Amino acid sequence: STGSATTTPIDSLDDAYITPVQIGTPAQTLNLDFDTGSSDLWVFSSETTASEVDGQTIYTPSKSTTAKLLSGATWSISYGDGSSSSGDVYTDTVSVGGLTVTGQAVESAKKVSSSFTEDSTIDGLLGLAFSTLNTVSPTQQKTFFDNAKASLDSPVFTADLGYHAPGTYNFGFIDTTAYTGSITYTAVSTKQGFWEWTSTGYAVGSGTFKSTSIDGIADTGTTLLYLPATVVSAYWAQVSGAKSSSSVGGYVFPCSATLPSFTFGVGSARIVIPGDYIDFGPISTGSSSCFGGIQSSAGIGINIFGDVALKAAFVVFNGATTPTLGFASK
Ligand SMILES: COc1ccc([C@H]2SCC(=O)N2C2CC2)cc1
C-alpha cells in the first residue's frame, strides 16, 4: 500500500504545517502537525478541558463505531518549546492520504498547554520519530508509520515541505518526479529515538564550504534551524546589523536586509537554503527588526534540522531494518 497527503503551512511564515488525517468511523477529519521529532499521535477531543479548546476541530470517540478505549492507558508529553499535553487513549482506524491503519493508538487530550489552545489551526500531532519515544503508559504504543510499515510497498515516508506553499507527505514510495538530481543517503542513529544524523558541514552565502561534523535531528515539528553557536555566529556576521538579542530570544536582523543563503552538507552533496527561507518577519507587528530562521542550539542540547532546512530538500525517512535518511535538492 501507499498514501499521499498534502501538507499546508498554517500561516504566512511557515510556522508549522498541517496535514488532514481521517480518524474513526465515519471519518472525523482533523488537521495534524506531522512531527518527525516525536512519537505520539494525539488530538484535541471531546474530553479536552473546554476552556482549553479555542477553534480546533475535535475528535469525539463516542461517535466512532470503531473507537475502543485502551483501558488504563494514559499519556503525557512535553515538547522542546515548553508546550505540553496529556490524556487517555483510544484505538481507532486512522487514514492518511489513502493509507489506513486499524487499531492505531489515538491519544485523546484531556489537557493542553496554552500554546496549543492559542493555535486554532493545529488539531493535534502525528509523531513520526521512533516508537521508543512514545509516552503511553503502562503499555507503550506504536507510531502510525511503525504500524503501517509492513503493509507499505517500501518501508519509507518522505517529507516535501513547501516554502510559503503546500507540499506533500508520501508513505510507501519515493516520487522520483519530486526532486532534482539524486538522493544522497546518510546514516541514522536511533539511540535517542530521533532521526539523528551527521551533516558534513556548511557554507554561508557564496562562501567556502567548511567541512565539519554536525550531529542533529531531522525534525519536521520544529520551525527553525538550530545549529552550534559558532556556525550561527558565522552566518549572522554576514548580515549588516544582525545581533543576538537576549530580550527577544535569538538573532534578529534589520528587516531591510537581503539574507544570504545557507548550505548544509549531506555526505558529499549540498542542500542550499535560500536566504528568504531564513526570514521570520517582524519581531512584533510593525517592527523593523526581523526574527532569524537560523538560531543557536546552545542550551537545547541537540542540533535541530527543522523546517527551515527540511523545506529546502526532498527528504526520505527510510525505515528499513537499519534506518537511513535521504536528501535531494528540488
Ligand atoms: C520574536 O520574533 C519572532 C518569534 C517567533 C517567530 C516564529 S518562529 C516559530 C514560531 O512559532 N514563531 C511565532 C510566530 C509564531 C517569528 C518572529
Can you offer a commentary on this structure?
The PDB classes it as hydrolase. The entry lists the keywords fragment screening, hydrolase, inhibition. It is a single chain. By secondary structure, the chain is mainly beta. It folds into 2 domains: 5-174, Acid Proteases (Cathepsin D, subunit A, domain 1, Beta Barrel), CATH 2.40.70.10; 175-330, Beta Barrel (Cathepsin D, subunit A, domain 1), CATH 2.40.70. It contains 4 helices and 24 strands. The protein has helices spanning 114-118, 144-148, 229-236, 307-310, and strands at 3-9, 17-23, 28-35, 41-43, 68-78, 84-96, 99-112, 124-127, 156-160, 167-171, 184-187, 196-204, 210-218, 225-227, 243-245, 250-254, 262-266, 269-273, 279-282, 289-292, 294-296, 303-305, 314-318, 324-328. Strands 18-17-12-13-22-14-21 form a 7-stranded mixed sheet. A hairpin with a 5-residue loop joins β12 (196-204) and β13 (210-218). The longest helix has 8 residues, at 229-236. It is globular and about 60 Å long. 46% of the residues are buried.
Task: List its traits.
44% strand, 330 residues, 4 helices, six-stranded mixed β-barrel, Cathepsin D, subunit A, domain 1, 2 domains, globular, binds (2R)-3-cyclopropyl-2-(4-methoxyphenyl)-1,3-thiazolidin-4-one, mainly beta, seven-stranded mixed β-sheet
- The CATH superfamily label of the largest domain reads Acid Proteases
Radius of gyration: 20 Å
Strand/helix succession? EEEEEEEHEHEEEEEEHEEEEEEEEHEE
Number of strands: 24
Q: Kindly report how far apart the N and C termini lie.
A: 25 Å
Main sheet attributes: strand count, strand direction, barrel closure: 7 strands, mixed
